[PDB]
Amino acid sequence: EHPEFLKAGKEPGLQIWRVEKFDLVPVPTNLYGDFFTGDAYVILKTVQLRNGNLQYDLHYWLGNECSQDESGAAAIFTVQLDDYLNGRAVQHREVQGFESATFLGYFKSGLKYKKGGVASGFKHV
Amino acid sequence: TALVCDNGSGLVKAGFAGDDAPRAVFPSIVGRPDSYVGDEAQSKRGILTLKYPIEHGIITNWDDMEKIWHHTFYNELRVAPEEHPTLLTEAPLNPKANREKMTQIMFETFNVPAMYVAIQAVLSLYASGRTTGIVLDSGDGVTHNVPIYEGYALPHAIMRLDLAGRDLTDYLMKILTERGYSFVTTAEREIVRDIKEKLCYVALDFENEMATAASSSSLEKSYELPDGQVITIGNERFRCPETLFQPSFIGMESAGIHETTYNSIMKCDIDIRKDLYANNVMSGGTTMYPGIADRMQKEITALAPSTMKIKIIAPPERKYSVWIGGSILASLSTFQQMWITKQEYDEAGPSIVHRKCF
Ligand SMILES: Nc1ncnc2c1ncn2[C@@H]1O[C@H](COP(=O)(O)OP(=O)(O)OP(=O)(O)O)[C@@H](O)[C@H]1O
Ligand SMILES: [Ca+2]
Ligand SMILES: [Ca+2]
Ligand SMILES: [Ca+2]
């Protein structure tokens, strides 16, 4: 029922969202591959299966300086998206500087890092 | 704003969803001569009978638990519970009837508009930014190993060890008395708990440390008592938490936490074991001992195939990991429809919790 869940994995391709203050916000398609190191992202790769179905790989990417609420949310969103896709996604934790070969493979001009990002959603006690 | 309450055997951790920490942390104790809760119950213990409504992570006294919850809402958080969706936590393998009871009380006694119950160990894994791993959760009353894959615990592989903080406090009391001091009374128990939390650590190699302790004074520490007297603690510093690895120290035939962790992993599907070894997450107050992570890394390495990638994760905030995971979960835009509502409870009754809350 979340707008972005409805849009997730409808066709082959790559979808990227950024965790922004406890919400999943779509990343502009022109900005794909440029990751803020202070933020966390959810990445869904959808592949056409010969069987007509779609193959799903969910990757949650964690920037070196992302806050606990962002890394926590990215993980939970991953579980929820996977559940939404009837459990059929394979889940991958991707840490800045240690990303898997297949994840790095998604970005044809190579992925790049940039310092900064959106502020934490947490209220400080 | 939603509320998050994490009820343990020894401590209640409560607060507001979206906060980075619980605003209320207090002893899970109810005293009766018409009732006192927490710290105020402890200070007046000479004139009342104290009871712990939660034993080994499981609620066993529902009358007293209601008082804990009432005190949490009104005295600690100062909220009208009827205004706030409330997330509660539960132990691994919490009986079905207990889950239903929890639900019944929240809607029927406190009249919350919405509620949810989550497994404590799963919330801690989420707090570490993980969907797959094995949690070692050790508090005041109980220790669990909980393997989790793609967001969900594997019930068949969960291990329970009835040895935690309380036993370690009592043991440190015994070995300090054996050293030459006398820690025996309920007031002396509270002092020893502070020594435990301040001076104890886990030795990387226990026998080597026992040799260093007997030949030198380099491992000795001084502690000032409330009366002003200064005492010296030696090998007791590391002998106390060694009990976690060698439960025979208190006359228990159970395997140590390193062996239960291995055993838990080995009960899981062979295809996920690598992910488990690489994601050992520690949570709870009893995992706070300096050196515990380094020792677990060493012990699991000795148990596993030599080529296995092993990683122990011990966040500084792991006393409150369960609570923080709950705070994050309840704050998510996607969590809004996941709550059990008052309407849904009225339609379906308490059994709704088994369908809405894994
Ligand atoms: N720095 C520390 N070092 C060692 N032990 C600690 C430290 N801080 C707290 N503890 C111990 O941790 C215990 C409380 O932790 P926690 O709140 O996780 O338990 P709980 O949730 O009440 O109990 P359980 O999870 O067993 O039901 C107490 O026994 C306390 O003495
Ligand atoms: Ca950020
Ligand atoms: Ca899946
Ligand atoms: Ca606990």
Short mmCIF file of C-alpha atoms and ligand atoms in Angstrom, two decimals:
data_model
loop_
_atom_site.label_atom_id
_atom_site.label_comp_id
_atom_site.label_asym_id
_atom_site.label_seq_id
_atom_site.Cartn_x
_atom_site.Cartn_y
_atom_site.Cartn_z
CA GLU A 1 0.00 0.00 0.00
CA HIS A 2 3.07 2.26 0.18
CA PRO A 3 3.27 4.04 -3.21
CA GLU A 4 6.83 2.80 -3.87
CA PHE A 5 5.94 -0.81 -3.02
CA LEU A 6 3.29 -0.70 -5.77
CA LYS A 7 6.00 0.44 -8.22
CA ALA A 8 8.65 -2.10 -7.09
CA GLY A 9 9.75 -4.83 -9.52
CA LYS A 10 7.07 -4.39 -12.20
CA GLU A 11 9.53 -4.72 -15.10
CA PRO A 12 13.18 -5.71 -15.72
CA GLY A 13 15.73 -3.05 -14.72
CA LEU A 14 17.17 -1.29 -11.68
CA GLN A 15 15.34 0.67 -8.97
CA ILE A 16 17.04 2.68 -6.22
CA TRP A 17 15.53 4.31 -3.13
CA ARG A 18 17.16 6.36 -0.37
CA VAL A 19 16.19 6.07 3.28
CA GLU A 20 15.04 9.59 4.18
CA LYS A 21 13.73 10.15 7.73
CA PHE A 22 12.05 6.73 8.14
CA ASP A 23 10.66 6.74 4.57
CA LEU A 24 11.65 5.13 1.24
CA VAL A 25 12.23 7.91 -1.31
CA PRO A 26 12.99 7.21 -5.00
CA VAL A 27 16.38 8.38 -6.33
CA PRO A 28 16.23 10.35 -9.61
CA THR A 29 17.26 8.00 -12.44
CA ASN A 30 19.93 10.46 -13.64
CA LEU A 31 21.60 10.27 -10.21
CA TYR A 32 21.99 6.45 -10.19
CA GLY A 33 25.44 5.30 -9.05
CA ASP A 34 26.39 8.42 -7.07
CA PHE A 35 26.06 7.34 -3.43
CA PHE A 36 26.14 9.70 -0.43
CA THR A 37 28.43 8.06 2.16
CA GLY A 38 26.33 9.58 4.98
CA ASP A 39 23.21 7.74 3.79
CA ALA A 40 21.67 4.30 3.25
CA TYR A 41 19.92 3.02 0.12
CA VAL A 42 17.73 0.11 -1.03
CA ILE A 43 18.45 -1.30 -4.49
CA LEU A 44 16.21 -3.73 -6.40
CA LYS A 45 17.48 -5.48 -9.54
CA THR A 46 14.70 -7.12 -11.57
CA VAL A 47 15.64 -9.67 -14.27
CA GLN A 48 13.33 -11.26 -16.86
CA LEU A 49 13.05 -14.97 -16.30
CA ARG A 50 12.65 -17.33 -19.25
CA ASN A 51 9.64 -18.70 -17.34
CA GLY A 52 7.77 -15.37 -17.70
CA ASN A 53 8.30 -14.51 -14.02
CA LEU A 54 10.76 -11.96 -12.63
CA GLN A 55 13.90 -12.56 -10.56
CA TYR A 56 14.50 -10.18 -7.64
CA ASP A 57 17.71 -9.20 -5.82
CA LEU A 58 17.38 -6.66 -3.01
CA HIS A 59 20.57 -4.92 -1.88
CA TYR A 60 20.69 -2.54 1.07
CA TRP A 61 23.71 -0.25 0.77
CA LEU A 62 25.19 1.26 3.93
CA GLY A 63 27.34 4.40 3.77
CA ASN A 64 30.29 4.70 6.17
CA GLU A 65 28.71 7.70 7.92
CA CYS A 66 25.00 6.71 7.78
CA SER A 67 23.10 6.95 11.07
CA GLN A 68 21.66 3.98 12.99
CA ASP A 69 18.07 4.90 12.01
CA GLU A 70 19.08 4.83 8.33
CA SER A 71 20.90 1.48 8.38
CA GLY A 72 18.15 -0.01 10.55
CA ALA A 73 15.41 1.28 8.23
CA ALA A 74 17.25 0.10 5.09
CA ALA A 75 17.38 -3.42 6.55
CA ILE A 76 13.70 -3.42 7.65
CA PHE A 77 12.50 -1.96 4.31
CA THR A 78 14.43 -4.79 2.61
CA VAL A 79 12.56 -7.44 4.65
CA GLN A 80 9.20 -5.70 3.98
CA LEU A 81 9.83 -5.36 0.23
CA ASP A 82 10.90 -9.02 0.07
CA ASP A 83 7.72 -10.06 1.93
CA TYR A 84 5.70 -7.85 -0.45
CA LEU A 85 7.26 -9.75 -3.38
CA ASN A 86 6.08 -13.05 -1.82
CA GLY A 87 9.49 -13.87 -0.32
CA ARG A 88 11.02 -14.28 -3.77
CA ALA A 89 13.80 -11.68 -3.46
CA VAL A 90 17.31 -12.63 -2.36
CA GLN A 91 18.58 -10.12 0.22
CA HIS A 92 22.13 -8.67 0.19
CA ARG A 93 23.86 -6.41 2.72
CA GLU A 94 26.25 -4.06 0.88
CA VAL A 95 28.78 -2.09 2.92
CA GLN A 96 30.67 0.85 1.41
CA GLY A 97 34.10 -0.38 0.25
CA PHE A 98 33.05 -4.04 0.42
CA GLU A 99 30.25 -4.32 -2.16
CA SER A 100 29.74 -7.62 -3.99
CA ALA A 101 30.86 -8.08 -7.61
CA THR A 102 27.23 -8.41 -8.81
CA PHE A 103 26.18 -5.17 -7.06
CA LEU A 104 29.13 -3.26 -8.55
CA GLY A 105 28.13 -4.84 -11.88
CA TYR A 106 24.80 -2.96 -11.91
CA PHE A 107 26.50 0.37 -12.61
CA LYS A 108 27.97 0.34 -16.12
CA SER A 109 30.05 3.51 -15.68
CA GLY A 110 31.18 2.44 -12.20
CA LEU A 111 29.70 3.46 -8.86
CA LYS A 112 31.07 6.54 -7.08
CA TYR A 113 31.01 7.89 -3.53
CA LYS A 114 30.32 11.42 -2.34
CA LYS A 115 30.52 12.83 1.20
CA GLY A 116 27.33 14.06 2.87
CA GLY A 117 23.65 13.14 2.88
CA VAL A 118 20.22 13.63 4.45
CA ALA A 119 19.98 14.24 8.23
CA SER A 120 19.01 11.53 10.74
CA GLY A 121 15.33 10.89 11.47
CA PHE A 122 16.07 10.31 15.16
CA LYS A 123 15.19 12.77 17.91
CA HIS A 124 18.21 12.97 20.22
CA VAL A 125 17.73 12.07 23.88
CA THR B 1 3.59 9.40 18.47
CA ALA B 2 3.97 5.68 19.14
CA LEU B 3 5.38 4.20 22.36
CA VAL B 4 8.03 1.49 22.68
CA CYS B 5 8.20 -0.68 25.80
CA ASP B 6 10.88 -3.34 26.21
CA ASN B 7 10.12 -5.42 29.31
CA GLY B 8 12.97 -7.51 30.71
CA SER B 9 13.49 -9.78 33.73
CA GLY B 10 15.52 -7.10 35.52
CA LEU B 11 14.87 -3.79 33.73
CA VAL B 12 12.06 -2.02 31.88
CA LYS B 13 13.21 0.12 28.95
CA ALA B 14 10.50 2.48 27.72
CA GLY B 15 10.16 5.54 25.49
CA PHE B 16 8.87 7.17 22.33
CA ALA B 17 9.22 5.82 18.78
CA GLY B 18 11.63 8.01 16.80
CA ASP B 19 13.82 8.80 19.83
CA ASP B 20 17.40 7.39 19.73
CA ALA B 21 17.12 6.01 23.31
CA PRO B 22 14.56 4.99 25.95
CA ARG B 23 13.66 7.88 28.26
CA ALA B 24 12.70 5.53 31.11
CA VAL B 25 14.87 2.68 32.42
CA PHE B 26 13.95 1.18 35.79
CA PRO B 27 13.93 -2.09 37.81
CA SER B 28 11.15 -4.52 36.86
CA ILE B 29 9.95 -4.92 40.47
CA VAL B 30 6.56 -4.56 42.18
CA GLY B 31 6.33 -4.18 45.98
CA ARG B 32 3.21 -4.71 48.12
CA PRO B 33 2.70 -3.91 51.85
CA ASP B 34 -1.02 -0.28 48.07
CA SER B 35 1.81 -0.86 45.55
CA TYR B 36 5.24 0.48 44.60
CA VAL B 37 7.23 -0.02 41.38
CA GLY B 38 10.96 0.09 40.57
CA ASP B 39 13.44 2.21 42.53
CA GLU B 40 10.85 3.38 45.08
CA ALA B 41 9.93 -0.25 45.78
CA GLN B 42 13.62 -1.06 46.41
CA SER B 43 14.18 1.84 48.84
CA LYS B 44 11.11 0.75 50.84
CA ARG B 45 11.81 -3.00 50.70
CA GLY B 46 11.93 -3.47 54.50
CA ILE B 47 8.18 -2.81 54.78
CA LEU B 48 6.94 -4.75 51.73
CA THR B 49 7.20 -7.96 49.71
CA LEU B 50 8.98 -7.55 46.36
CA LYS B 51 8.11 -9.59 43.28
CA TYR B 52 9.54 -9.86 39.75
CA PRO B 53 6.64 -10.27 37.28
CA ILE B 54 9.03 -11.44 34.53
CA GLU B 55 11.06 -14.62 35.04
CA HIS B 56 13.60 -15.71 32.40
CA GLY B 57 12.09 -13.21 29.93
CA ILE B 58 8.55 -14.58 30.31
CA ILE B 59 5.70 -12.78 32.10
CA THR B 60 4.45 -15.01 34.96
CA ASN B 61 2.54 -12.58 37.21
CA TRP B 62 -0.10 -10.67 35.25
CA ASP B 63 -1.46 -8.63 38.18
CA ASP B 64 2.05 -7.30 38.87
CA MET B 65 2.76 -6.82 35.14
CA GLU B 66 -0.27 -4.53 34.83
CA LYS B 67 1.25 -2.39 37.61
CA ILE B 68 4.57 -2.26 35.74
CA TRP B 69 2.73 -1.05 32.62
CA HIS B 70 0.55 1.44 34.53
CA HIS B 71 3.68 2.89 36.19
CA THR B 72 5.46 3.05 32.81
CA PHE B 73 2.63 5.05 31.17
CA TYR B 74 1.66 7.38 34.03
CA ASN B 75 4.69 7.76 36.29
CA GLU B 76 7.58 7.43 33.83
CA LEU B 77 6.48 8.47 30.33
CA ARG B 78 3.57 10.58 31.66
CA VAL B 79 1.26 9.72 28.77
CA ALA B 80 -2.41 8.89 28.35
CA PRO B 81 -1.98 5.36 26.90
CA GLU B 82 -5.34 5.63 25.10
CA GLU B 83 -3.70 8.21 22.80
CA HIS B 84 -0.66 6.19 21.69
CA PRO B 85 -0.04 3.12 19.54
CA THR B 86 2.18 0.89 21.66
CA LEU B 87 4.91 -1.51 20.54
CA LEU B 88 5.84 -4.20 23.07
CA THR B 89 8.63 -6.78 22.92
CA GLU B 90 8.63 -10.48 23.79
CA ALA B 91 11.12 -13.26 24.50
CA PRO B 92 12.09 -15.92 21.95
CA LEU B 93 9.61 -18.84 22.17
CA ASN B 94 7.03 -16.79 24.14
CA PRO B 95 4.00 -19.05 24.75
CA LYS B 96 0.94 -18.34 22.56
CA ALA B 97 -1.34 -17.69 25.55
CA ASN B 98 1.10 -15.06 26.87
CA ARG B 99 1.01 -13.17 23.54
CA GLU B 100 -2.81 -13.18 23.67
CA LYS B 101 -2.80 -12.00 27.30
CA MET B 102 -0.45 -9.11 26.45
CA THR B 103 -2.83 -8.10 23.64
CA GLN B 104 -5.94 -8.40 25.83
CA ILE B 105 -4.51 -6.19 28.60
CA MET B 106 -3.30 -3.45 26.20
CA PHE B 107 -6.68 -3.08 24.46
CA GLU B 108 -9.03 -3.86 27.39
CA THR B 109 -7.18 -2.38 30.39
CA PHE B 110 -5.13 0.49 28.91
CA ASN B 111 -7.39 1.04 25.88
CA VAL B 112 -4.55 1.67 23.39
CA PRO B 113 -5.72 2.60 19.86
CA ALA B 114 -3.16 0.21 18.33
CA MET B 115 -0.51 -2.32 19.36
CA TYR B 116 2.22 -4.65 18.10
CA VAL B 117 4.47 -7.31 19.64
CA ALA B 118 8.00 -7.96 18.33
CA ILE B 119 10.69 -10.52 19.19
CA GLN B 120 13.52 -8.86 21.16
CA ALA B 121 16.43 -10.58 19.35
CA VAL B 122 15.02 -9.68 15.91
CA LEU B 123 14.77 -5.98 16.92
CA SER B 124 18.46 -6.04 17.98
CA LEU B 125 19.53 -7.47 14.60
CA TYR B 126 17.53 -4.73 12.82
CA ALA B 127 19.26 -2.13 15.05
CA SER B 128 22.65 -3.39 13.80
CA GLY B 129 21.48 -2.85 10.17
CA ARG B 130 21.10 -6.58 9.38
CA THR B 131 18.39 -8.98 8.18
CA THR B 132 20.48 -12.14 8.60
CA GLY B 133 22.61 -13.19 11.58
CA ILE B 134 22.69 -14.95 14.93
CA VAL B 135 21.94 -12.91 18.04
CA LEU B 136 23.38 -13.61 21.46
CA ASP B 137 20.94 -11.86 23.81
CA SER B 138 21.95 -11.93 27.49
CA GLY B 139 20.19 -9.79 30.09
CA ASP B 140 19.53 -10.09 33.82
CA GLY B 141 17.47 -13.31 33.81
CA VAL B 142 18.10 -15.27 30.60
CA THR B 143 20.54 -15.84 27.71
CA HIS B 144 19.36 -16.81 24.17
CA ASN B 145 20.97 -17.63 20.83
CA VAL B 146 18.61 -16.63 18.03
CA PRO B 147 19.48 -17.35 14.39
CA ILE B 148 17.58 -15.15 11.94
CA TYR B 149 17.33 -15.37 8.15
CA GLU B 150 15.96 -12.64 5.86
CA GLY B 151 14.17 -10.91 8.72
CA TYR B 152 12.77 -13.91 10.60
CA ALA B 153 13.98 -16.04 13.52
CA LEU B 154 14.36 -19.80 13.05
CA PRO B 155 12.41 -21.18 16.04
CA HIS B 156 13.78 -24.74 15.85
CA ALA B 157 17.38 -23.50 16.20
CA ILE B 158 16.84 -21.13 19.16
CA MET B 159 18.91 -21.99 22.26
CA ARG B 160 18.01 -20.99 25.83
CA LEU B 161 20.49 -20.71 28.72
CA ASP B 162 19.10 -19.92 32.20
CA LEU B 163 22.22 -18.06 33.28
CA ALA B 164 22.57 -14.27 33.07
CA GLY B 165 23.44 -11.05 34.93
CA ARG B 166 21.74 -11.97 38.22
CA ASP B 167 23.73 -15.22 38.55
CA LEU B 168 26.98 -13.38 37.72
CA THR B 169 26.26 -10.77 40.40
CA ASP B 170 25.61 -13.54 42.96
CA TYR B 171 28.80 -15.38 41.94
CA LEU B 172 30.98 -12.25 42.26
CA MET B 173 29.47 -11.84 45.75
CA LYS B 174 30.61 -15.38 46.63
CA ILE B 175 34.18 -15.09 45.31
CA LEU B 176 34.73 -11.64 46.88
CA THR B 177 33.67 -13.16 50.22
CA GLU B 178 36.13 -16.01 49.56
CA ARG B 179 38.86 -13.42 48.90
CA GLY B 180 38.49 -12.01 52.42
CA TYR B 181 35.61 -9.54 52.29
CA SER B 182 31.94 -10.11 53.14
CA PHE B 183 29.23 -9.39 50.56
CA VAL B 184 26.03 -11.19 51.60
CA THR B 185 23.11 -8.84 52.34
CA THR B 186 20.65 -7.25 49.87
CA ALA B 187 22.39 -3.88 50.28
CA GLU B 188 25.74 -5.59 49.54
CA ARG B 189 24.22 -7.19 46.42
CA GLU B 190 23.62 -3.73 44.93
CA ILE B 191 27.24 -2.75 45.62
CA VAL B 192 28.57 -5.93 43.96
CA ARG B 193 26.38 -5.27 40.89
CA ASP B 194 28.14 -1.91 40.50
CA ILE B 195 31.60 -3.53 40.87
CA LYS B 196 30.59 -6.11 38.23
CA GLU B 197 29.45 -3.40 35.79
CA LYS B 198 32.54 -1.25 36.43
CA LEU B 199 35.53 -3.56 36.95
CA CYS B 200 34.83 -6.96 35.34
CA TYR B 201 36.15 -8.06 31.93
CA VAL B 202 36.49 -11.22 29.83
CA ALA B 203 39.98 -12.72 29.54
CA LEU B 204 41.07 -13.69 26.02
CA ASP B 205 42.92 -16.64 27.56
CA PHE B 206 41.60 -17.51 31.02
CA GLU B 207 44.41 -19.78 32.28
CA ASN B 208 47.11 -17.34 31.16
CA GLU B 209 45.23 -14.57 33.01
CA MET B 210 44.98 -16.73 36.14
CA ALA B 211 48.77 -17.17 36.00
CA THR B 212 49.37 -13.42 35.55
CA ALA B 213 47.04 -12.70 38.50
CA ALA B 214 48.96 -14.97 40.90
CA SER B 215 52.44 -13.73 39.92
CA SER B 216 51.69 -10.00 39.70
CA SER B 217 49.39 -7.19 40.89
CA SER B 218 49.11 -5.55 37.44
CA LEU B 219 45.50 -6.76 37.03
CA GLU B 220 44.32 -5.45 40.42
CA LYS B 221 41.85 -2.57 40.79
CA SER B 222 40.62 -0.43 43.70
CA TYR B 223 36.95 0.29 44.40
CA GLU B 224 35.56 2.78 46.90
CA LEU B 225 32.60 1.54 48.95
CA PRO B 226 29.75 3.96 49.89
CA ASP B 227 30.95 4.02 53.53
CA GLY B 228 34.38 5.23 52.35
CA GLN B 229 36.37 1.99 52.66
CA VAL B 230 38.55 0.98 49.68
CA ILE B 231 38.79 -2.66 48.55
CA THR B 232 41.02 -4.46 46.04
CA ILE B 233 39.63 -6.79 43.36
CA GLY B 234 42.06 -9.13 41.58
CA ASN B 235 41.28 -12.21 39.48
CA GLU B 236 37.58 -11.88 40.38
CA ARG B 237 37.42 -9.24 37.61
CA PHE B 238 37.64 -11.88 34.87
CA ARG B 239 36.56 -14.98 36.84
CA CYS B 240 33.05 -13.56 37.19
CA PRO B 241 32.16 -13.32 33.44
CA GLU B 242 34.16 -16.50 32.69
CA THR B 243 31.03 -18.24 34.07
CA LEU B 244 29.35 -17.44 30.72
CA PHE B 245 31.93 -19.65 29.00
CA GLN B 246 32.27 -22.13 31.88
CA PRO B 247 28.86 -22.51 33.60
CA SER B 248 30.35 -25.20 35.91
CA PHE B 249 31.70 -22.22 37.92
CA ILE B 250 28.23 -22.00 39.49
CA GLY B 251 27.52 -25.76 39.31
CA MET B 252 25.71 -25.79 35.95
CA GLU B 253 26.10 -28.70 33.50
CA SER B 254 25.12 -26.45 30.57
CA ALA B 255 27.36 -25.59 27.61
CA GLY B 256 28.97 -22.12 27.57
CA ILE B 257 27.75 -19.28 25.31
CA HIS B 258 30.40 -20.07 22.68
CA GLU B 259 29.20 -23.69 22.40
CA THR B 260 25.48 -22.78 22.37
CA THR B 261 26.21 -20.32 19.54
CA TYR B 262 27.95 -23.07 17.53
CA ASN B 263 25.15 -25.54 18.35
CA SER B 264 22.47 -23.08 17.21
CA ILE B 265 24.23 -22.42 13.87
CA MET B 266 24.64 -26.18 13.30
CA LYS B 267 20.87 -26.70 13.70
CA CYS B 268 20.21 -24.31 10.79
CA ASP B 269 20.07 -25.11 7.06
CA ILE B 270 23.64 -25.70 5.82
CA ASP B 271 23.20 -23.08 3.07
CA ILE B 272 22.79 -20.18 5.56
CA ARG B 273 25.50 -21.10 8.10
CA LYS B 274 28.23 -18.99 6.46
CA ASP B 275 26.00 -15.87 6.80
CA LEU B 276 25.42 -16.74 10.48
CA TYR B 277 29.15 -17.11 11.29
CA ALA B 278 29.87 -13.76 9.64
CA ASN B 279 27.08 -11.97 11.57
CA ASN B 280 27.20 -12.83 15.31
CA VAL B 281 25.43 -9.88 16.97
CA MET B 282 25.65 -9.37 20.73
CA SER B 283 22.82 -7.69 22.66
CA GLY B 284 21.82 -7.12 26.29
CA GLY B 285 23.45 -5.80 29.46
CA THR B 286 25.36 -9.03 30.18
CA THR B 287 27.28 -8.77 26.88
CA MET B 288 28.76 -5.41 28.03
CA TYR B 289 31.98 -6.86 29.55
CA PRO B 290 35.16 -5.53 27.91
CA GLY B 291 36.88 -8.26 25.87
CA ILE B 292 33.75 -10.41 25.35
CA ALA B 293 33.76 -9.92 21.55
CA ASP B 294 37.47 -10.78 21.18
CA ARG B 295 36.96 -13.91 23.28
CA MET B 296 33.89 -15.03 21.29
CA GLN B 297 35.81 -14.48 18.04
CA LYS B 298 38.57 -16.72 19.42
CA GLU B 299 36.18 -19.43 20.71
CA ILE B 300 33.99 -19.68 17.57
CA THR B 301 37.16 -19.80 15.43
CA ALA B 302 38.28 -22.84 17.45
CA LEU B 303 34.88 -24.53 16.88
CA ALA B 304 34.35 -23.78 13.17
CA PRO B 305 36.22 -25.05 10.07
CA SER B 306 39.51 -23.13 9.80
CA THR B 307 38.49 -21.34 6.56
CA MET B 308 35.21 -19.96 7.98
CA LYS B 309 34.85 -16.16 8.00
CA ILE B 310 33.78 -15.22 11.53
CA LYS B 311 32.70 -11.79 12.78
CA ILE B 312 31.38 -10.77 16.20
CA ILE B 313 29.41 -7.51 16.30
CA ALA B 314 29.13 -5.79 19.67
CA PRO B 315 27.64 -2.29 19.35
CA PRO B 316 28.46 0.16 22.19
CA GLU B 317 24.71 0.78 22.62
CA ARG B 318 23.83 -2.93 22.96
CA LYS B 319 22.23 -2.44 26.41
CA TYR B 320 19.41 -0.72 24.48
CA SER B 321 19.61 -2.43 21.04
CA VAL B 322 16.23 -4.15 21.48
CA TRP B 323 14.58 -0.84 22.37
CA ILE B 324 16.30 1.07 19.51
CA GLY B 325 15.20 -1.53 16.93
CA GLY B 326 11.62 -1.10 18.19
CA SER B 327 11.93 2.69 17.92
CA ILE B 328 13.08 2.42 14.28
CA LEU B 329 10.43 -0.14 13.29
CA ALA B 330 7.52 1.82 14.82
CA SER B 331 8.71 5.01 13.05
CA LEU B 332 8.68 3.62 9.47
CA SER B 333 6.16 5.01 6.95
CA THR B 334 5.38 1.38 6.04
CA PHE B 335 4.58 0.38 9.65
CA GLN B 336 1.29 2.33 9.80
CA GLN B 337 -0.83 -0.57 8.47
CA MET B 338 1.09 -3.24 10.43
CA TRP B 339 -0.35 -2.27 13.84
CA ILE B 340 -3.20 -4.28 15.32
CA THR B 341 -5.99 -1.69 15.67
CA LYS B 342 -8.69 -1.51 18.36
CA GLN B 343 -11.23 -2.24 15.58
CA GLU B 344 -9.34 -5.36 14.44
CA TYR B 345 -9.12 -6.54 18.06
CA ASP B 346 -12.87 -5.99 18.58
CA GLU B 347 -13.63 -8.03 15.44
CA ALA B 348 -11.13 -10.88 15.95
CA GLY B 349 -10.23 -10.92 19.66
CA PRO B 350 -6.78 -11.69 21.15
CA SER B 351 -5.88 -14.41 18.57
CA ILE B 352 -5.28 -11.66 15.97
CA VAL B 353 -1.74 -11.34 17.43
CA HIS B 354 -0.74 -14.70 15.88
CA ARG B 355 -1.67 -13.44 12.40
CA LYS B 356 -0.41 -9.86 12.58
CA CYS B 357 2.76 -10.41 14.68
CA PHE B 358 5.39 -13.08 13.89
N1 LIG C 1 28.61 -2.61 31.73
C1 LIG C 1 28.06 -3.77 32.17
N2 LIG C 1 28.82 -4.88 32.34
C2 LIG C 1 28.30 -6.04 32.77
N3 LIG C 1 26.99 -6.21 33.05
C3 LIG C 1 26.11 -5.18 32.90
C4 LIG C 1 26.61 -3.88 32.44
N4 LIG C 1 25.54 -3.05 32.39
C5 LIG C 1 24.46 -3.77 32.79
N5 LIG C 1 24.80 -5.03 33.10
C6 LIG C 1 23.89 -6.11 33.56
O1 LIG C 1 22.90 -6.43 32.58
C7 LIG C 1 21.69 -6.85 33.21
C8 LIG C 1 20.49 -6.07 32.64
O2 LIG C 1 20.51 -6.10 31.21
P1 LIG C 1 19.15 -6.12 30.31
O3 LIG C 1 18.35 -4.86 30.55
O4 LIG C 1 19.58 -6.44 28.89
O5 LIG C 1 18.37 -7.36 30.96
P2 LIG C 1 16.77 -7.62 31.01
O6 LIG C 1 16.17 -7.31 29.66
O7 LIG C 1 16.21 -6.93 32.22
O8 LIG C 1 16.72 -9.20 31.34
P3 LIG C 1 16.40 -10.44 30.34
O9 LIG C 1 16.77 -9.97 28.96
O10 LIG C 1 17.29 -11.50 30.92
O11 LIG C 1 14.93 -10.72 30.55
C9 LIG C 1 21.91 -6.65 34.71
O12 LIG C 1 22.22 -7.92 35.30
C10 LIG C 1 23.11 -5.73 34.81
O13 LIG C 1 23.90 -5.94 36.00
CA CA C 2 22.28 10.43 6.52
CA CA C 3 13.43 -13.90 0.21
CA CA C 4 15.80 -8.29 27.57
#
